[PDB]
Design a protein around this ligand. Structure first.
Ligand SMILES: Cc1nc(-c2cccc(N)c2)cs1
Ligand SMILES: Cc1nc(-c2cccc(N)c2)cs1
Lengths: 269, 268
């Protein structure tokens, strides 16, 4: 991979692997989400920021501040087949004192056509206290020279799906998968549960008949609280809708504390 | 990747990814095992065999016959760091009517030094009845032109670790991780649990303090029975000693054995 000519975005090519595909012989949404994280990490390395997933400056490291994903929104038109080459372009942009945004465009390497797009909202948080804080001018200025100055949005549309408010699923859920636990393969280098694991956990409560007759088109996922390595999770889903839509809730198995909420949109194969 | 000059082995380079590393900022043994699978699959594609993990011929497909892993043995000297390039060379060899063997050598691309090696034993099985069968001459001959004729072993030493008999762990286990279940990410394209998931499940019962102060050097794992998508697994471990452990994976209900293995760990 490499930064583009103007140095304000990063591109990288990936060949889809045999273990990265599902029952359709095409890449799963979790393989896609891992590739988004990989290209995000290589973009941070290219410009001197931390490579641990929190993309910090030396100023943020001294204050124990990190960037944390608040929302992930992914829209796939065609999942790359095994052996296909996918090219992903990524960039970041400040959104005032609220937080920052990382966007991605996925393309078929052979045809040059757009096969997907994603956006994510990030907030700044103290690593130890877990307290959120509005971005300061001095931290903001450190990032502005690595971002486009004019707005560049993967989801420019008027009332786009990426910014819609997600409601809380009310019991009883129509479907559930109970007692989900992370294993060591689900942890990152800092022993935190990888953000992509939560996507997998959300999808566990979708009936197999939906997965077998439909394809996932859109997933929007809010991240409210972290699942610890020793926590147990319950994944809940209810149909809200040719296209099928679902409302999702991930909560801790004991007290029912919310860790994530989301929506998925599926189209008939 | 590509077949080598003589066409009897296959090589491929991989750049270690950010999500592929553990707490040491180096590739996990599960990332290594997935890369062994990937290069095995690209080798099969390069010579016209099936790419579903069973590396079948048209003769085997007609008979509903598949190749299934019976044993995996992996020895790592240095785990590749994040961003490093690792080159893996793989080849196959027939072992008479018993089954076949796939071997691998891992190397650091920059230095050319060997950083690891692996071997695996495969048996032929009817995919529907699950009955094992000794290889026939007609199926064996189809593969012989894609394999070295003289023996080529990743583990040459007479009576080496890769061929040692593994005993059955007796209750009570010293450590355990119970109620392990596969999710969709653990399945392959044919909706079967990926062989690498079982390695992860074995390692779940190793205490965190061992993982934090030691590095995994050798893992030998026997595959006895398949975990179905709706099965629940218990992972059991007992110290037998460098630290050595005996492992057992069994179905949560009746205690039916799915795998047994050993691991050897070195102090960091
Ligand atoms: C690798 C890069 N990260 C960024 C980035 C990271 C956090 C916040 C903002 N505003 C930008 C720009 S280029
Ligand atoms: C891709 C390849 N598979 C083989 C292979 C596969 C099964 C049995 C034997 N004896 C060889 C050689 S090259």
């Amino acid at each position: 991979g490499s930064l583009t000519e103007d140095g304000l975005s990063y591109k990288e090519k990936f060949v889809v692997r045999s273990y990265e595909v599902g029952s359709n012989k095409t890449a799963t949404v979790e393989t896609i989400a891992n590739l988004l994280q990989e290209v995000g990490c290589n973009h941070a390395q290219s410009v001197g920021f931390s490579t641990d997933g929190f993309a910090t400056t030396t100023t943020m490291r001294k204050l124990h501040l990190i960037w944390v994903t608040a929302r992930m929104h992914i829209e796939i038109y065609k999942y790359p087949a095994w052996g296909d080459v996918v090219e992903i372009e990524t960039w970041c942009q400040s959104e005032g004192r609220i937080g920052t945004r990382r966007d991605w465009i996925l393309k078929d390497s052979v045809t040059g056509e757009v096969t997907g797009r994603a956006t994510s909202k990030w907030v700044m948080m103290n690593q130890d206290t877990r307290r959120l804080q509005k971005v300061s001018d001095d931290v903001r200025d450190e990032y502005l020279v690595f971002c486009p100055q004019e707005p560049r949005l993967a989801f420019p549309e008027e009332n786009n799906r990426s910014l819609k408010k997600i409601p809380k699923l009310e019991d009883p859920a129509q479907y559930s998968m109970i007692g989900l636990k992370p294993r060591r393969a689900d942890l990152d280098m800092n022993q935190h549960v990888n953000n992509v694991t939560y996507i997998g956990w959300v999808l566990e409560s979708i009936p197999q008949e939906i997965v077998d007759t439909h394809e996932l088109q859109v997933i929007t996922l809010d991240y409210r609280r972290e699942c610890q390595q020793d926590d147990v999770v319950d994944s809940l889903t209810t149909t809200t809708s040719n296209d099928s839509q679902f409302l999702h809730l991930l909560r801790l198995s004991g007290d029912g504390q919310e860790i994530n909420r989301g929506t998925t949109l599926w189209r008939k194969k």
